[model samples]
Target: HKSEVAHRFKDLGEENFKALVLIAFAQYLQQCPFEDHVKLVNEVTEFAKTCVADESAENCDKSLHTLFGDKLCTVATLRETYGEMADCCAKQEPERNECFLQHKDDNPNLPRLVRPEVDVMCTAFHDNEETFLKKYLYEIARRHPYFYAPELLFFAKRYKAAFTECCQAADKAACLLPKLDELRDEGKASSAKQRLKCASLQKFGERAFKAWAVARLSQRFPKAEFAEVSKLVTDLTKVHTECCHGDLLECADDRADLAKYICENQDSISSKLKECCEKPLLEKSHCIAEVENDEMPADLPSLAADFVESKDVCKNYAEAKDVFLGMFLYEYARRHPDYSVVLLLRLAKTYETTLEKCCAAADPHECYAKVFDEFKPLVEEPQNLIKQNCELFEQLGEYKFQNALLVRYTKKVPQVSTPTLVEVSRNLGKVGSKCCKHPEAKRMPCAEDYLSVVLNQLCVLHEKTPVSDRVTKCCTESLVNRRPCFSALEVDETYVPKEFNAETFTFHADICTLSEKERQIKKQTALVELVKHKPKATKEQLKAVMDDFAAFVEKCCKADDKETCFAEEGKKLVAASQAALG
Candidate 1:
């Protein structure tokens, strides 16, 4: 038994610890507050333990209520922990079930055991329909002071079952008649010269309640006698309006309730109004009422008028209606057609009036279509116009003749220049320099143009020009005077002839020979040093040095070997220096 308890506790502790670590790490990753992290960790840990120990399941339920209660609940965390607990329970289902069942009666108010009020309401509505109706209606009347006729009407339209259930709960007329009678009696009291005001206040509440019920009922039965309901509602409104004189607080609850109901049952009520009231008159009246009340305007005859007239007498009416309806249909289409249609209709009517009164001007349709087409897309798909404008500027090259013409026609000087190829090339270089400086200019179109010009110039100089001419011109241009570009003395010192034979060659001795033996010896010493010092003196270097010496010796040698052979001796000395360096 001790071992079993220890094992169970150990397993529970491990599970809780793992859950806490995961939750804590998640919180840390999210950078949530320490308090929030602690709360989440504790919640997940407790839930994990609950799954492992059956007794802990009841404890977990109570803990949930203590933590969350009527305040905010972390649904996601609860769900995750519940899933972990379920997995734990699956391992020891019989033991867990027995443990939970034994402690199930401990606390009924635990969140896991008890349903929330909203859930209770839903269940009650499904099962005990009569009690649910009574509770909901009473709650709406007392708790939700803003509940009014229109909201009831809207509720009826949406949930016919709930509406019918509510209407059948009590004698609505009976409940309302007494309130009306009280208001009438209050109106006659002398102690209150403000009796009429007091009476209106009382009547407002009664009428609001009646309107709410009637609207709700009418929503369910659309073909019902809504005219009677409207008359009663309108009468109540007049009484409230006249007696209170816009002291709206006196009937604020009633007005708010009515507004909410109207908004909720807007479609059904609108249909009823269409059947009962004069279509154009009611619409115009509604529009004017909305403007006066600062309420969103309904789509009415006034909106149609605005659609036909250039100057909107009820300006906000159309705008408000459009806003309300725009959640669905062609808001863009309606707006586009409205303004153009209004302009055309106004023009045609004005022209007709003028032709009748005096002499009219030209046909409006000719200019109308052209103007409409230009602005139609702007209204319909404004983004497309923006995109097209951007593309036009993007495709615009260095020269813009059309833009210049436009500027001229507009009587404006062309601030932008139309550049030629040479100008473009120079501009490109300037742009390239700017791009290097700014870094962002590399993305600019001008930068590409600049690069192209540079590449073209390079191709011309390299591929088109001859190598000999290039080398010659480079040397000439690079030189200061007659120094062979680098130095004239260096060239003169280095220049050598292929043949120096006086017998076989044709040159005089003074032109090629040394005057003194010392001068010849010094020259041979310099040649040996040059050959030895040459980087990684190879066989080719040795051969070149020897060939030069042999040529000189052949030219200087007289008849046999001892013809003052300085060149032959110089060749031997150079060969010896190379061997020594190696």
Candidate 2:
């Protein structure tokens, strides 16, 4: 199961081992920030290279002593763990790697590593970038003993890049924190991709999953030779086969190895993916996930390539259900570039499950014939929803459309603070306004890409508490299905407040004196309150009331007796809203 773990420790030939030692030593020097540290790394790496070739307990002791001197036992538990592994060298050749691996588990348990928040990290980096980077790598590497030497090197480079980019900026934390957050997401997204692939291999069976992976990866890295793609899929499949069983460290280490594998082969695979491969291990996974698939191969099959009209569905599916569905997905997905890989996977599973039930029906052929009909609405509805949103955005204009979304969101989840609601809506509003301006051919893609980001933020914002039932339903959903679930939501009809306060909407003389942008913002604030109070009010009724108020503002602000006009018109406007609410 963890052959890679053993191989990582044992398979490093003398030259490769020495090279890695030097690279690691160079990275460590970045942390030491000293000229004398320079002399130590080369000397230390040379001594360790001999120990690697000899494989002697005495050489291991000498290597540890050379690297850590008399402090080998006292410096850190990390060094102690290395000393433990050195004891394994006393064992014979065949058993040595196993003994070494076992000693890894003997390392002292440290508390979970919690990174400093941006402010602390930024302040520390400002004080001394080199020392902070060193401590940062030290803290994480010691905690996760499975991390490879190159990965540590990668981490230091990324950390230094972040400090270099942000530390000199006026708003250091603001610039630094999001990159930190992004780095966090990169790891999460990478692990998630690994987990999903493992789940697929288990659920669909290895043969079928490989078939799908080949198709998917081949399309993604179109320039790669068929042999290269096949090797990539095979290597990836092996990661899942072993790691998915339950060994967390094996999974993490192997995934890092996989990231290295891809990065090393970037020339054959799409070089466009070089940036992703260059990212530190986990972040590399996310970057790869984000890399767009190249153009579909001209020789690729059509959507119905695997679904012959005359074929016996029951017999074929029963023989190898996963392979059957996998081929179908492989065919279906290459033809539909707009659908995400996750979406395509779900759709594939749905097809398989539907066919599974149909095979047992009283008339299997009749049931099989209707499976596509069952799948149609699932495919068509999401497209229709996106289209419907674009239509609404175009109809209402940005300001009003944003207010409308805010109203629906607030009415549905009143427990969220007004500031959050306003902020989320303003961001979404800008997305809709901007995306809807794209030419018709490009509009949906533009909207889908940008809107997913904002909607994801909203879902992430409420993930912990889930302020309302509507939010809870979507926030807890898997990333694959969450966006469509959120898009399908409507205003919660049951959330009627106990009362409305029309005075909160009181007209002010300041509105007339302020800039037009300020006036629109002030009106939007009032509109949000109105919708929150009158949750059940019809769109027409709310619009009619707001339109009347707008007319009042025009007339009163222009009146010769401004004070009296505002006082009188404001009362009529409040009355109109109250009537609409009733």
Candidate 3:
């Protein structure tokens, strides 16, 4: 045997080893935030590989959905620092509680692009799915002629009962993604199977969407006869199929166009679906061919190409050729504990920029190797990493970008907290539907000028830590949107809430002014959303729950407080509703 339990550490190379070691410490500490059993099976598996000789990497990762994947985010969340992890791993025998209080100097933490909790993710997934079907599902099903045959190949081709179960489970507090993935259609058969699951999920998603639409429409358009609502949903679903062949690659444009058409025709088509599904929103629309398929584009780069292990860059910072790489990477990891590998790798280029400048490489492609030669390894972590991070961060100063400004013009006045804080997120969706489909590409610029404005403005209001995560949340989400999502805080045109803002958001951007329709839409949609959640309850049951919530809120909640009020008082209302239901 090549390994032993006392210690037989298989070299998972340098980076992977550090990851495994950190996982080991988290498990040993049993202080993980995700509290089921103090230690996760995935956590044990990361360390398990090092202790056993000939333990295949697959052996460690085989069942662990998040142990390795969850590694960086978990490490970044460590109450005890990496210095402790480093010192603990160094010891012949480590104390459980006893940690060495040291600092990570050169060690750059990984850069995070997306940090999500289970609830946020679950809510977003369901939100997108429902929103898509609200507009597209009814139409798509009718496009195909065989509208009512349930057992036919159209639905048959896409059906996965287990995947639906997994999706449903993931949407709850238990948030067992691995369990969900395992429980649901676990097939590695082919790309065909993957597409099948994609279609199946969206197919199910449409059903969920349709039920909500029926209920919401019945409530929303009281004058419209709702007799045929169920039939309309059934008809649309039958015609359903997912992206096939090259259709997947080109779908982004069509989806964007769909938003445009819906926004343009907001007066009639999308809103009046309850008027007997006869509106034909897509009749003239090019996106008529494009049904909302839930899967992401397969070719999309999860990691940025900027960062690479392939770069044979040297790290001999004996003289600090490019200390910024270490500092940038280090500062980034501390700030963004929740990161993707590709983002960290991409952000790693921050340091290399300094390296490429100093190296004097005539051949730029080969320059990374020249850069790599300057570094030595520290224990197992990169030696370039141990640089004093906070000092480096302080010295680094504000992250600069073009079009960055935080201006409070004369118009900034008469600001006060609002009970209307609840309405903050409502009008914002309409804004997204509008701006995303703006007739001029000028609105959707080559660069996000609005975001830089929004970010700087946020700095003035929130954290003075310029360009730190206070604004990084904006940058992270708006990676795909031209305007940061939080711009609704100040910019009325940019209406989506950062995370469903319940508190009265103060603003400095004078351009933002909410319209009457936008305000009404928020009130309407909020009730619609509440209705959608309560499937078993009758009409206005959840709406009544909102009253229950409002009654609860009016008592416990204040004008400026949505956070603690909703969280603490929300449970009481939830329990009351459950009792009422009983």
Candidate 4:
């Protein structure tokens, strides 16, 4: 109860100060498990101590980050590691420098790291060098601990064991190749599930695998800051696929092998840096790739072309890939008329972004061919992907070439004949986004917001000048010396680019670019094409509908009086045309 002077307490510093507090309490807690937080706190508090604690380690590092007369130094890293012993450690002088290296390895705050999965991968490739994994992980943590979590030891252990087992297997998935000599030679090509399983495992161990787990976990568990393991895993798996899966199992859950390892090895967290100090915001993020075939396996069965490809796009997209796979499995070949390739591609890209942000937390291959899982017929068919294309076209489908030219004409020279450039700009924004800008990796506005921004330009800019002037703008102030700001245009103070569609009483659209003659031709072409596609219309119905259409075009379109033509007549003719086709 007795340190008399307060100034003496202040001068010794936090590290030395913390020791007085901890050791005062520690003698009482010397026996209980250090793992028990509540036990340590409750043990020495006989009288209610009005205690206050802070992440002063972080604060002190920034504030009093200094050295002592003893030629010793201090920082939060050392403070957290040595605790009350900071001053003792700090007082060690040149002797303290040696203590730094000795404790750095054991510093709970910044321990060295590892990757059981990649480690196992490297093990197979390194011809089973056991310490290689540990050594390299240590180097990685030393180089970049905050990149990958040295934790996730449970899963990491499982991955390594499975990878090693595969490395030893006869010929990888090739051994499972149904009409294969190995499976027949081994006499164990059993169930249909067996075939699929072999395909998946072989696909996993060799054909390639995606460590979508990082990206998957990224968004799903944002609280965590996982470092990069994809490349190490990729390199390991590249060597893995090079090996043979000799005597294939009749059917093995590689995870079962993994489960066993997890139980037995029980990856201890002692050597690993338990918490990652933040590194770059996300450097190796894209390092994951859209379609990662380096999966030591792959993602799908149907969608050909890149069926055997890799990168940020895979299993279609971890997002749409589930139902998307089914859509392709059956309909990709059978119902060609239904879905669009562009739609599927965009759908595939969606997951690439999702993978860019979150990958395997939602397995892309979980629903392969037993697609519905025998309880299959219970859900509706894979019709969604078919409709998905049309929806995409309406939303983000980029208009290019001929469509781009049409859009440019409408946006640059809209006349009364043009129905509404809102839809026109919608396509153009997506066009510019996908075409002019790389929409995949860049942070971008949504379709609606993008359309609104440019349209705001159309309305807010000097509408009387040449269309080229509208395309160019103020100073380029970013990574890309492109985007312009016509600030002097007073820029629709409310409707400018940086703006979200912050709810307001406003509307915007692209101006008419098609000339009076061209506008008339476009209006007639739109009406006629609408009628022709109504191949929906019978010859008899077409004869009658064309006669009435001729009357509307003569009364409206031909005259170049778009407001009169569209003031309901343009819309009126659409329903009438469909009915006429019927």
| CA lDDT of each prediction against the hidden true structure | 0.33, 0.62, 0.33, 0.32
Best by lDDT: 2
Tens-digit lDDT string for candidate 4 (1-582): 122112223443433333232322222222223333223323222111212122232212221112221212323333454454455454434454334333332123333333244334444446734333333323333332112121212222433454455555676434223222332222211222223323334633432133322222222222221222332334434322322221111011232232232223222201111122121112112122221111111232344333323333453555565343333222221222122222222333333343434344464433232222322221112233223333454454443222333433332333312333434343453435442333221222222223333443443233354333433342112101112232123212222122212122111111134554464445334533333233233446655654675576556534454565544574676565555544
- Shift of residue 532 alpha carbon in model 4, Å: 18
Residue 264 in model 1: lDDT: 50
TM-score of 2: 0.57
Ranking by lDDT: 2, 1, 3, 4
Report the C-alpha displacement of residue 501, candidate 4, in angstroms.
30
Query: Candidate 2 on 116-189: residue-level lDDT in tens?
Result: 67777777888886556655555554444433444455556776798789977878878887777667655433
Every model's Cα RMSD, please?
38.1, 9.5, 30.6, 26.8
TM-score of each: 0.17, 0.57, 0.19, 0.18
**Candidate 3 local lDDT, residue 10:** 42
The better candidate by TM-score, 1 or 2, is 2
Residue 15: error of model 2 in Å?
20
At residue 478, give the lDDT of candidate 1.
13
Candidate 2 segments whose C-alpha is farther than 4 A from its true place:
1-253, 259-290, 361-366, 370-374, 388-401, 413-467, 470-481, 502-529, 538-582
TM-score of 3: 0.19
Model 3: weakest 10-residue lDDT segment is 401-410
Which of the two candidates, 1 or 4, achieves a greater TM-score against the reference?
4
**Model 1: how far is 54 from its true place, Å?**
69
